[PDB]
């Protein structure tokens, strides 16, 4: 998280960390959506240009963490991976199209105050909240700045930018399975996701029901917190069909 602040305990309890088994290292972020399910970004386990073909027993999942490293005794739950569902039509070559992947845990997790899932947007909430100029939270232990290593979970709130701006904000191909969010140069306010926040959720708290909704998934960008540059996230609802498909497995 670039130009953010330290997290309050359990303000993102659904925040999930992808850890690698050997060498023991962080990969990126994810999101607790179910009790046995976690949702991340596909480039975070499969990006051939970076020689990445991560298997089940290559990865851990650390839920309900706060300190980036030190093993929080009697707080964080470390889980195993049983199955990994990556989107078949994940266009990794061009523009991380359908940058999304799901994770079946060995068996379910018991919730604490530090572990608690986020809601998925329905047909209504998606249209209702995902208007440009509306604000949403992004979390992760990602870079503080592009090269940036925070000791604690980082938080930022950012407005959705409208499709036109994003379309030509970059020379990269933009789809509706993608949305851009962040700050205009003029806006004086700064903020953006950085490399390492990937798979982390773009959450929006609904005003009707005080429930939190993961609207996005930290996908990509060009640099970090740059002027005319906005963080790109995976459009959750425009994939809630495939999402539903593989949970009904």
């Amino acid at each position: 998280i670039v130009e953010g602040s330290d997290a309050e305990i359990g303000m993102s309890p659904w925040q999930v960390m992808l850890f690698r088994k050997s060498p023991q290292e962080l990969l990126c972020g994810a999101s607790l959506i179910s009790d046995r399910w976690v949702l991340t970004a596909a480039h975070c386990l499969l990006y051939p240009p970076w020689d990445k073909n991560f298997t089940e027993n290559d990865l851990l999942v650390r839920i309900g963490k706060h300190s980036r490293t030190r093993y929080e005794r009697n707080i964080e739950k470390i889980s195993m991976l049983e199955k990994i569902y990556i989107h078949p039509r994940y266009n990794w070559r061009e523009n991380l199209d359908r940058d999304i992947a799901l994770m079946k845990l060995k068996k379910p997790v018991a919730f604490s105050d530090y572990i608690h899932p986020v809601c998925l947007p329905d047909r209504e909430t998606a249209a209702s909240l995902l208007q440009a100029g509306y604000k949403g939270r992004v979390t992760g232990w990602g870079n503080l700045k592009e090269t940036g290593q925070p000791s604690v979970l980082q938080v930022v709130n950012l407005p959705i930018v409208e499709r036109p701006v994003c379309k030509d904000s970059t020379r990269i191909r933009i789809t509706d399975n993608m949305f851009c969010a962040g700050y205009k140069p003029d806006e004086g306010k700064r903020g953006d996701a950085c490399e390492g926040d990937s798979g982390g959720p773009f959450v929006m708290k609904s005003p009707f029901n005080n429930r939190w909704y993961q609207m996005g998934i930290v996908s990509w960008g060009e640099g970090c917190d740059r002027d005319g540059k906005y963080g790109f996230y995976t459009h959750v609802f425009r994939l809630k069909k495939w999402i539903q498909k593989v949970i009904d497995q």
Partner: peptide
């Protein structure tokens, strides 16, 4: 079923630092 309600914010009936900030945008 119980998602999106933080058992120390929504459940303890509490605001965070900047959920107010989020609300004010809508």
């Amino acid at each position: 079923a119980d998602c999106g309600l933080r058992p120390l914010f929504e459940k303890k009936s509490l605001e965070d630092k900047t959920e107010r900030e989020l609300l004010e945008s809508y």
